[PDB]
Amino acid sequence: GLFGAIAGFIEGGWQGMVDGWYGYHHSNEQGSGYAADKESTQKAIDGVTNKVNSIIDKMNTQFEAVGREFNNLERRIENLNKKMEDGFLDVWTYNAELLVLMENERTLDFHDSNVKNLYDKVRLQLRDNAKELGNGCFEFYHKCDNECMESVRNGTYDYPQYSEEARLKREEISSGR
């Protein structure tokens, strides 16, 4: 898509996250698992539900065809009557089909924008305490338990706290050993 996340640097989605659209995959000493972001998932749902209501609702009023009968010497206005009711149905069909096509695109690039924006919320929390792998994953330069991963999820993560352990682990890879 437009933002290069979905089917981008994150090739593939996680069959295993059955409790949200977007989320996390932690991996420490205690083990690993899936965890959905509570806040960003909800932000898109309200947006999609408002769009779905916005589209139905704008088609509130639309031409409603009516029966009219004409005799054998009212041929002209019989024809005027027909091309008019036809005309409006063509307009409102076109107005509808086109709106979905257009809001279908914007919907997909909304989700795309949402993944890429979750990736950057984390990247700009950790910075140099972790190394960017390029596949959408982060490898920490420090030790991080389950209450530490949680601090990243809900946005609690403390940078100066681990920055010393990370800056010493960075130097070890500088030496070679």
């Binding site: 090739e11 593939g12 996680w14 779905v52 409603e64 065809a65 009711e85 409102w92 509808a96």
Partner: protein, 324 residues
């Protein structure tokens, strides 16, 4: 040795729902929503409580004037909508014309109920022959007859005394009133039926002022007949009165219709018959029972219905794109 990790990813599943977009067709996604209703029940139903008026093989003309073969609709109950075939068989049994007929059909769309009333008793035509007004183009069942709500008067003995007849609408609702005139084939026939050779029909209201004259002509046979009948109508306002006067060729009322209930209605053109069902949305093709905001059945619908579009497919994308 693998250092601790965190990953950000997105949902996917086993969905094969496909949407379209401006640049791309048939894009498979996580969740989709159809908003187009495509199914109906092939039947004509009641509309909430109320049964539709289904003329079988009659036309609106046949009903109101009282075509003999149309006896089914002699005193119909209150309706929700009228259904009429494309080319009804039992129309004007005696060949001729119904004046401003479409403008009348139009009035019907805001009428839900008539109440037939007698305004000039068939018994009262004391000096004319009420009972000879009968034609082979107007068969009951072999017995030749005539329209029932109107009466074709003929000369009594050898004379046709001048008619003066009137009705004052003392009802509180409006009155649909009908009558007609007979166009003979020649002078010879004119005098045979009515005696007076030069004749007229006058009709007076607070708003009408009509004077019709028979129109002799040599014409092709229709249903074995060369003569023609030409029918007329008016709405008679409460407390207003109608006065007829004639002298020959007069097709006089017996019954007229009081408009007793108005409301939304339509005359629906359809070949269907009664569906013994019930809806909140009706169509000349079948009823619709749906939550969908859209349908593509038929543009002419009545009741609480989805909006019509001509599209074959309308599906919205709700979830995100499903894995490549």
């Amino acid at each position: 040795d693998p250092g601790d990790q965190i990953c950000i990813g997105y949902h996917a599943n086993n969905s094969t729902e496909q949407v379209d977009t401006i640049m791309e067709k048939n894009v498979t996604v996580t969740h989709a929503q159809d908003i187009l209703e495509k199914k109906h029940n092939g039947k004509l139903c009641d509309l909430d409580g109320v049964k539709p008026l289904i003329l079988r093989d009659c036309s609106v003309a046949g009903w109101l004037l009282g075509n003999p073969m149309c006896d089914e609709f002699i005193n119909v109950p209150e309706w929700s909508y009228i259904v009429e075939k494309a080319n009804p068989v039992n129309d004007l049994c005696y060949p001729g014309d119904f004046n401003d007929y479409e403008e009348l059909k139009h009035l019907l769309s805001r009428i839900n109920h008539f109440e037939k009333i007698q305004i000039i008793p068939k018994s009262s035509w004391s000096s004319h022959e009420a009972s000879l007004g009968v034609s082979s183009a107007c068969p009951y069942q072999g017995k030749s007859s005539f329209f029932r709500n109107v009466v074709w008067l003929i000369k009594k003995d050898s004379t046709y005394p001048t008619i003066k007849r009137s009705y004052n609408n003392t009802n509180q609702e409006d009155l649909l009133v009908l009558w007609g005139i007979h166009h003979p084939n020649d002078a010879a026939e004119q005098t045979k039926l009515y005696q007076n050779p030069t004749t007229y029909i006058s009709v007076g209201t607070s708003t009408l002022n009509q004077r019709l004259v028979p129109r002799i002509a040599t014409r092709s046979k229709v249903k074995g007949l060369s003569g023609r009948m030409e029918f007329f109508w008016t709405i008679l306002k409460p407390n207003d009165a109608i006065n007829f006067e004639s002298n020959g060729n007069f097709i006089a009322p017996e019954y007229a219709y009081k408009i007793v209930k108005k409301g939304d209605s339509t005359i629906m053109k359809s070949e269907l018959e009664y569906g013994n069902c019930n809806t909140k949305c009706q169509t000349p093709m079948g009823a619709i029972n749906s939550s969908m905001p859209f349908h593509n059945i038929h543009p002419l619908t009545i009741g609480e219905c989805p909006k019509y579009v001509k599209s074959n497919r309308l599906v919205l994308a709700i979830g995100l794109r499903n894995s490549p």
